[PDB]
Amino acid sequence: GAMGSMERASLIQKAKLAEQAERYEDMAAFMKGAVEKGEELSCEERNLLSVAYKNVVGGQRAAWRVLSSIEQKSNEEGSEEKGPEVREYREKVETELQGVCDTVLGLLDSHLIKEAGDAESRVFYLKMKGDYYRYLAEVATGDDKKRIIDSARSAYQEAMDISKKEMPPTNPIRLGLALNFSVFHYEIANSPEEAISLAKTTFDEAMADLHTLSEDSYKDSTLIMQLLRDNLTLWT
């Protein structure tokens, strides 16, 4: 692509600069460039990858939600419908969101999941796979929707299996995965009981083995634990 001639170390550096300037589109493009060099990502680089695309798609999702809400105060017919304009723009945002999701899932399949080594690394990418399928599911319909939901679930479940075998119960990747998988249960798979069950199990097992989080990431761990308890507060 456009990043082919630039050194891998320069791409990482510029992604960090883009993060500082909150240019998440550029950040993503620099990290896509780095991933395409064909070498493993370290812990720090994987996080830069995730931060970039989560923020790109998060923006598209928030716009999608604004348009959807507007659209559904004035879809309820009988009153004024302004014509196709709201639907048209929402569909535009959707297509763009679909594009970015398709990109991340392509990098993951070609080839982050392939050439991972760490149990940590396999889980991190399988969790990402789950997430970007989940984002596709939020706006998809019909047969495409069912394909996507089973793809997300298949990725999440394999990530969880490995994580339960290979990672302490306070590991932040383990925790972040369970958090997001429980969100999938609630918001995508129409299984709120299984969402609550997972979130509570995850929190309680974290507490029971609190002695296991590490000097490097305990701050990440405690925040996700708090996020789990907040969702539980909301969902019960």
Binding site: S69, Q72, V183, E187, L223, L227, D230, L234
Partner: peptide, 18 residues
């Protein structure tokens, strides 16, 4: 941290509401 938490709450509540 509390900003992160509040944003999370708003996003998750959105789904419940709409």
């Amino acid at each position: 941290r509390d900003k992160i938490r509040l944003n999370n709450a708003i996003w998750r509540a959105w789904y419940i509401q709409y």
